[PDB]
Nucleic acid binder design. Structure first.
Ligand code: MG
Ligand code: MG
Ligand code: MG
Ligand code: MG
Ligand code: MG
Ligand code: MG
Ligand code: MG
Ligand code: MG
Ligand code: MG
Ligand code: MG
Length: 234
RNA sequence: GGGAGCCCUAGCACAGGUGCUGCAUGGCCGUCGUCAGCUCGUGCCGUGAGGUGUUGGGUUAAGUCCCGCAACGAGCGCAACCCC
């Protein structure tokens, strides 16, 4: 739960497709790439991790949203490590603003797996058997850890604001605090708690969600060890 | 001398009408068409009528199934359940 000269190589990123609104968090245009104000990344982190502490203490959940493939797997472990839910494959229209209706898909998954521990997987025609077993396929594929959500989450952790911007918009419309791993292509003001790092490159990404989940466990009550991911990021 | 009932005149209340209106109508039928379509709930977009979903790419006899996607689903159809 720290590291400051964990610039490592995960400080600055992105070329000139910036959101000029991200101007404060930049250090220079070192050869076609804005590099991120190192200090600010650490002090925004201060007020940020602070936020997340009180969330684990009060016993609420954080929905980890990362769809970007260069961060996809990482989300799965760190979100499984902590109890919290994750949206991993792709983000659906109304996971939040339509959160009731979307949860029928959860009502079915949990209940369709109950078909697969019964005598009725031998019963039922195979007209149903083929359809109703490759339907369970897809369900577990998108809601592999949305099903953990039983109500709207107290906050939400996105790894790319720009890319998962439908996720962001939904959060706001329901007044759900946005934590985000952001960099130069994003609108910082659209985000409540910003870690101005860089949405792409696993060396960042995982470092952040490691230390974040470290802190979540550390503050919930468990004080643990290295992660399932770590330097298993190639 | 009256009475129930049945056959009966003479008047009543009504019957009956394949007389009109199929644009006053129900019912049933023809037809586009056994064509693959027509909608809904909630969400999202839009001042609004409305839109998205139902568009895109592949496939099928088929909105048939697949991939994808601000949508996630569902109903009436298709298919199947019936017969030869
Ligand atoms: Mg990006
Ligand atoms: Mg008459
Ligand atoms: Mg008629
Ligand atoms: Mg047909
Ligand atoms: Mg015919
Ligand atoms: Mg307009
Ligand atoms: Mg409106
Ligand atoms: Mg259309
Ligand atoms: Mg198509
Ligand atoms: Mg169909």
């Amino acid at each position: 739960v720290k590291e400051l000269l964990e610039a490592g190589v995960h400080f600055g990123h992105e070329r000139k497709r910036w959101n000029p609104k991200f101007a404060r968090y930049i250090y220079a245009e070192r050869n076609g790439i804005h590099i991120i104000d190192l200090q600010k990344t650490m002090e925004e982190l201060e007020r940020t991790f602070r936020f997340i502490e009180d969330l684990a203490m009060r016993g609420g959940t954080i929905l980890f949203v990362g769809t970007k493939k260069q961060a996809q797997d990482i989300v799965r472990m760190e979100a499984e490590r902590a109890g919290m839910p994750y949206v991993n494959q792709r983000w659906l229209g109304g996971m939040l603003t339509n959160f009731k209706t979307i949860s029928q898909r959860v009502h079915r998954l949990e209940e369709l797996e109950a078909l697969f521990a019964s005598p009725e997987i031998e019963e039922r025609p195979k007209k149903e058997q083929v359809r109703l077993k490759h339907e369970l396929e897809r369900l577990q594929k998108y809601l592999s850890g949305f099903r953990l959500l039983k109500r709207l989450p107290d906050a939400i952790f996105v790894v790319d604001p720009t890319k998962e911007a439908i996720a962001v918009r939904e959060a706001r419309k329901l007044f759900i605090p946005v934590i985000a791993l952001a960099d130069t292509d994003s609108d910082p003001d659209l985000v409540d708690y910003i870690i101005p790092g860089n949405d792409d490159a696993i060396r960042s990404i995982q470092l952040i969600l490691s230390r974040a989940v470290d802190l979540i466990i550390q503050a919930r009550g468990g004080v643990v060890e290295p992660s399932p991911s770590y330097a298993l990021v190639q």
